[PDB]
Design an enzyme around this catalytic site. Structure first.
Site, PDB file in Angstrom:
ATOM      1  CB  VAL A   1      51.663   1.981  21.476  1.00 20.41           C
ATOM      2  CG1 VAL A   1      50.217   2.110  21.892  1.00 20.41           C
ATOM      3  CG2 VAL A   1      52.332   0.747  22.124  1.00 20.41           C
ATOM      4  CB  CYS A   2      48.503   3.505  16.827  1.00 18.29           C
ATOM      5  SG  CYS A   2      47.585   4.759  15.964  1.00 18.29           S
ATOM      6  CG  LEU A   3      46.526   5.128  23.403  1.00 23.45           C
ATOM      7  CD1 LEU A   3      45.190   4.419  23.129  1.00 23.45           C
ATOM      8  CD2 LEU A   3      47.208   4.551  24.596  1.00 23.45           C
TER       9      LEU A   3
END
Ligand SMILES: S=c1[nH]c2cc(Cl)ccc2o1
Length: 156
Positions: A91-93
């Site tokens: 996940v890119c967050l």
């Protein structure tokens, strides 16, 4: 790491006492059968009334020894179609990067709710996979159609 383990025990106690409905977050085990607080198996339910409804999306959360200095790595297993999920499942967050918006006080509950919110609201300045990003940009109806099919695939 005593610092990591004591925080993770805190997190597990709080999670068990009060967590959002339909979410799962459970420590795994070491080869000797003891608890491994550094590797959790989690699941995020799709939000009702959205294209993600009815899906239950499995995610591993992996903590480094210097946690909570660092955020966990959060990885959908299996990987998901979404603009901000890498093909690996990671996940890119921004809250999940130490040099961006991670703060040590952020809880596992906040992380999982943050990822759930990401699912239904991609960040198009930050794409992580080409395909979902391109479809999201070119045809929002088709994007939603693919999300719905994925949610069905991952229904309990
Ligand atoms: S069952 C089952 N396997 C699994 C793996 C992860 Cl990473 C998260 C939740 C899971 O439920």
């Amino acid at each position: 790491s005593g610092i990591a383990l004591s925080r993770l025990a805190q997190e597990r106690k709080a999670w068990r006492k009060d967590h959002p409905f339909g979410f799962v977050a459970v420590p795994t085990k070491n080869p000797d059968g003891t608890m491994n607080l550094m590797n959790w198996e989690c699941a995020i339910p799709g939000a009702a009334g959205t294209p993600w409804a009815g899906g239950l999306f499995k995610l591993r959360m992996l903590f480094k020894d210097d946690y909570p200095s660092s955020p966990p790595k959060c990885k959908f297993e299996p990987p998901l179609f979404h603009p901000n999920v890498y093909p690996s499942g990671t996940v890119c967050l921004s809250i999940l990067e130490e040099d961006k918006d991670w703060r040590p006080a952020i809880t596992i509950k906040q992380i999982l709710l943050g990822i759930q919110e990401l699912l239904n609201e991609p960040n198009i300045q930050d794409p992580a996979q080409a395909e979902a990003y391109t479809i999201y940009c070119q045809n929002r109806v088709e994007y939603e159609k693919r999300v719905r099919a994925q949610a069905k695939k991952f229904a309990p």
